[PDB]
């Protein structure tokens, strides 16, 4: 996260860290949507252009974290994957369309003050909150700039959803209905964006109707980080919910 701020303790208790076994490193962000399912970007697991094809045993899920690098004894929980499910029409070859995957945990995680699932939007939630100007919240342990380095603790930043024509006109990539973009414009003066390591984390919004946090987006892609006239693109979670439900129902 660029131009964010340190997260408060238990501020994002659905935050999940995708961690590589060997060498030990942060692979991406993710989110806890139930006691045994984690949601992240397909490109965190599968990205043939950079030779990424992670399997279950390459990774761990760390839940309840705040510090990036510490082992947060008594606070975090560390879980193994039983199974990875990538959207079958994830388009890595062109624009990361449908950039979404699910990970089933081998065992149920226990909820606590630091571990707790975020809600998934239904059609009305999406309809009412996914509007230009409405702000969402992005969190992650990614880079503080494109080029200080890495944060000591989980970073947070609130960014406004941007009009779809403005998203379009900011890039050469073909934008689909399974994506939305967010970030301030140059004239708004305020800054903020996801950056390298933030991928797969959640873009959430707090419904003013039932006062619950909903994960509307998944950090997908951007051109650089926090560049003027550029925006972060996020997977539209509600549009791919049928797939999410199908996977969880069947598996």
């Amino acid at each position: 996260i660029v131009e964010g701020s340190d997260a408060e303790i238990g501020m994002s208790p659905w935050q999940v860290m995708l961690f590589r076994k060997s060498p030990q490193e942060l692979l991406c962000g993710a989110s806890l949507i139930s006691d045994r399912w984690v949601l992240t970007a397909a490109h965190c697991l599968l990205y043939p252009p950079w030779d990424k094809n992670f399997t279950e045993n390459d990774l761990l899920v760390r839940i309840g974290k705040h510090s990036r690098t510490r082992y947060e004894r008594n606070i975090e929980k560390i879980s193994m994957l039983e199974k990875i499910y990538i959207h079958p029409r994830y388009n890595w070859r062109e624009n990361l369309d449908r950039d979404i995957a699910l990970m089933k945990l081998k065992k149920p995680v226990a909820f606590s003050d630091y571990i707790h699932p975020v809600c998934l939007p239904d059609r009305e939630t999406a309809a009412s909150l996914l509007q230009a100007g409405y702000k969402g919240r992005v969190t992650g342990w990614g880079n503080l700039k494109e080029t200080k380095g890495q944060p000591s603790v989980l970073q947070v930043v609130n960014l406004p959803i941007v009009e779809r024509p403005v998203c379009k006109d900011s890039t050469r990539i073909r934008i689909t209905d399974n994506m939305f973009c967010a970030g301030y414009k140059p004239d708004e003066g305020k800054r903020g964006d996801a950056c390298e390591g933030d991928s797969g984390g959640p873009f959430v919004m707090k419904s003013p109707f039932n006062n619950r946090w909903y994960q509307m987006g998944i950090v997908s892609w951007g051109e650089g980080c926090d560049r003027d006239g550029k925006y972060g693109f996020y997977t539209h979670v509600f549009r791919l919910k049928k797939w999410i439900q199908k996977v969880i129902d069947q598996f």
Binding site: G10, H116, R137, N158, P160, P208, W213
Partner: peptide
Amino acid sequence: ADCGLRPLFEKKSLEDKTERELLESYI
């Protein structure tokens, strides 16, 4: 179920330092 309700915020009726920024943007 109890999803999206934080044990250290909503559940205790405490607000985080920037959630109002979000609310203020939902017009």
